[PDB]
């Protein structure tokens, strides 16, 4: 009968330690707050969003303030090809003389980090040149974070609290965001490219002190109204042009060169601007157009579960398109920085997609009404529900037996001294597509390997001018634009498919079995996350919808891991110009053990040793740190509540019976973590361990050999 926790009234009467844990676990779980109403819920969400908004801005301000103060951007802009970007200083009192001596690196005198987020390459392209331009963004974001905070506070006050109808006006939000949020922002970013970014890449300084005076083009805005848009197709930059300075600089602000800049190996600024200007137009027009709509509007989980499903899709795209299409100068050449950005965003994509299906299952338990959803599209998947899972179950089984089978087949015959007996399947359907995209390496000789096809010529309106720049790049093996593939790429791609199929099955089944099955017809009555249904009826562990999300988090990490494992190993050879090592060893699993894990861990594992230490001791310590916390998760997942609760009782007895200690007492009675709690806590250790093992290895292995 204590005041804490406020949001959960029932928890507040629990006299044990469970109260504190669950009071944290049910705090921001607003849908089960005591005495809550729908109108208060929506107004609270809006304000909560501002807090997140402020944090992202502060984070980027923290990404700005520390670089301007302790980084080396001004030093970096001068010759990016050898300077290591500095994240921030190292102020750790436990450091010794020899640890300061090792991390005083990147040409610094005090210890600092070597940054790998790529913000230096991104900010350069955007037009930032000096540390003081950095200092402006952090200060500006500080106000914007406080302005979002004030606004969140503002829209919670009586006179400014919105009504319910405003929050549920779905069509207007899409219209206003593709109008505003998408339309106006993309068009303006083309403007920031042409009014700021492009001049600075051509040696011309444009700042607040002069931006109103210097125009982006010699005689612009007289052709603009008269329809003579073609004047902006004036003289681009020559192949001899040196990025960031005026030796070879042109005057174009809108182009369609295609390919990559020969020096930077990244997109043309003028090319990025036209793309954003064009997409902007598309969203502004579509944003002026406005039974399932009555269902997607009343469930906050359905909207979010699609919003993560949209976020999860485009997060994967960001990883796929940034490694093959580098958009920032020299970002293709900073290989560790190429490695961190791909892995990071791919893991995020896995969480959102898994999360999308997780919140979908919550919708099915608390909001899906069988009688307001009848004879529509939603309830017709529930109709043949047993069919979808059963077929999906088969494909996973099918994929697994054969994909593992081919790898083991190759391994054995290779183990016996006979590599020629391996089963190596050429990715001919894939090799078709690159050849259809213009890659004349595989020689399939149709569709822009065909020099006369109507696609390459485009006899309609003489449009196709991305083609020269593109064809040069697709045949040169100096980038990652449609990388060469062989037997290794075939097997992994089917493994990834196997990973995508097994991960999707559990998440779809979890949502589809959330409301009920034969083993548990009334599952919906117990809510989303509950322990089980006892040892009766054969046993019911891991029967809750939450547990399905929980098991799937193990499968996604494996899937997203295999993708990042594949992407990493392949890139090692290309960056070291010896693609042959990977091509022959990646078709059997011992190669991934000998030439990928063991081989690339040589330096990382020697970050410190009995003879000294180097600048990789953190990564070496973190690697071991990750292994420990990964393994710590196994403890909570294998040993369950009962064992611990009985163990705790002997400690409670011992404390109360020990003089000089008996005198003091706990306020909350000690109890073991809950059944669901342990799964989450175990998985959290496991997953953090999964990443911080991979983060330590990925960064350290590449930073030592380049």
């Amino acid at each position: 009968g204590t005041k804490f926790p406020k949001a959960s009234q029932a928890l507040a009467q629990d006299p044990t330690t469970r109260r504190i844990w669950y009071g944290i676990a049910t705090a921001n779980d607003f849908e089960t707050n005591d005495g809550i109403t729908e109108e208060n819920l929506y107004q609270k969400i809006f304000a909560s969003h501002f807090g997140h908004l402020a944090i992202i801005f502060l984070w980027t301000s923290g990404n700005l303030f520390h670089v301007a103060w302790q980084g080396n951007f001004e030093q970096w802009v001068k010759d990016p090809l050898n300077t290591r970007p500095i994240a921030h200083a190292i102020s750790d009192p436990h450091f010794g003389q020899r640890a300061i001596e090792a991390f005083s690196q990147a040409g610094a005198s005090s210890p600092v980090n070597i940054s790998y987020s790529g913000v230096y390459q991104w900010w350069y392209t955007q037009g930032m040149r000096t540390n003081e331009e950095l200092y402006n963004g952090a200060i500006f974001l500080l106000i914007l974070s406080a302005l979002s905070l004030f606004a969140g506070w503002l829209h919670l006050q009586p006179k400014f609290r919105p009504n319910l109808s405003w929050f549920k006006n779905a069509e207007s939000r899409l219209n206003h965001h593709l109008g505003g949020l998408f339309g106006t922002s993309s068009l303006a970013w083309t403007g920031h490219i042409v009014h700021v970014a492009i001049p600075e890449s051509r040696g011309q300084h444009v700042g607040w002190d002069n931006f109103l005076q210097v125009a982006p083009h010699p005689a612009g805005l007289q052709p603009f109204f008269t329809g003579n848009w073609g004047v902006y197709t004036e003289n681009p930059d020559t192949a001899n042009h040196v990025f960031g300075s005026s030796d070879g600089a042109g005057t174009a602000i809108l182009t369609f060169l295609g390919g990559f800049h020969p020096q930077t190996q990244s997109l043309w600024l003028t090319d990025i601007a036209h793309h954003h200007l064009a997409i902007a137009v598309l969203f502004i027009v579509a944003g002026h157009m406005y039974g399932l709509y009555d269902t997607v509007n009343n469930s906050l989980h359905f909207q979010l579960g699609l919003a993560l499903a949209a976020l999860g899709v485009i997060t994967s795209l960001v990883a796929q398109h940034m490694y093959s299409i580098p958009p920032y100068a020299y970002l293709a050449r900073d290989f560790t920085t190429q490695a961190a950005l791909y892995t990071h965003h791919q893991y995020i994509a896995g969480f959102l997609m898994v999360g999308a299906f997780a919140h979908g299952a919550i919708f099915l338990v608390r909001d899906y009404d069988a009688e307001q959803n009848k004879n529509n599209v939603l309830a017709r998947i529930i109709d043949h529900k047993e069919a979808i899972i059963s077929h999906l179950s088969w494909v996973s089984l099918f994929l697994g037996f054969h994909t593992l089978g081919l790898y083991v087949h190759n391994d054995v015959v290779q183990a016996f001294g006979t590599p020629e007996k391996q089963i190596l399947i050429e990715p001919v359907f894939a090799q078709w597509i690159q050849s259809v995209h213009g890659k004349s390496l595989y020689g399939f000789e149709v569709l822009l390997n065909n020099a006369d096809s109507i696609t390459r010529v485009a006899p309609g309106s003489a449009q196709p001018i991305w083609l020269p720049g593109w064809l040069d790049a697709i045949n040169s093996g100096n980038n990652s634009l449609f990388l060469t593939i062989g037997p290794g790429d075939f097997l992994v791609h089917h493994a990834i498919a196997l990973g995508l199929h097994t991960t999707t099955l559990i998440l779809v089944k979890g949502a589809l079995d959330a409301r009920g099955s034969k083993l548990m017809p009334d599952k919906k009555d117990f809510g989303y996350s509950f322990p089980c249904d006892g040892p009766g009826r054969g046993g019911t562990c891991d029967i809750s919808a939450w547990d399905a999300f929980y098991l799937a988090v193990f499968w996604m990490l494996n899937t997203i891991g295999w993708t990042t494992f594949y992407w990493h190993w392949k890139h090692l050879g290309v960056w070291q110009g010896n693609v042959a090592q990977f091509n022959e060893s990646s078709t059997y699993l011992m190669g991934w053990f000998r030439d990928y894990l063991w081989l690339n861990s040589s330096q990382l594992i020697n970050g410190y040793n009995p003879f000294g230490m180097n600048n990789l001791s953190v990564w070496a310590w973190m690697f071991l740190f990750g292994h420990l916390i990964w393994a710590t998760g196994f403890m909570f997942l294998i040993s369950w509540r009962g064992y611990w609760q009985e163990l705790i009782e002997t400690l409670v007895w011992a404390h109360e019976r020990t003089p000089l200690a008996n005198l003091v007492r706990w306020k909350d009675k000690p109890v073991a973590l809950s059944i669901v709690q342990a799964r989450l806590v175990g998985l959290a250790h496991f997953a953090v361990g999964y990443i911080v093992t991979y983060a330590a290895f990925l960064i350290a292995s590449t930073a030592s050999k380049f």
């Binding site: 204590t2 804490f4 102020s91």
Partner: peptide, 30 residues
Amino acid sequence: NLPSILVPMVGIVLPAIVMALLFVYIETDE
């Protein structure tokens, strides 16, 4: 002269108070 004071305030001094405030908030009642 700036981080040498600041990091043992945020890492040491700050959790000594914000867990002290969040000890008297978890274990008090109405």
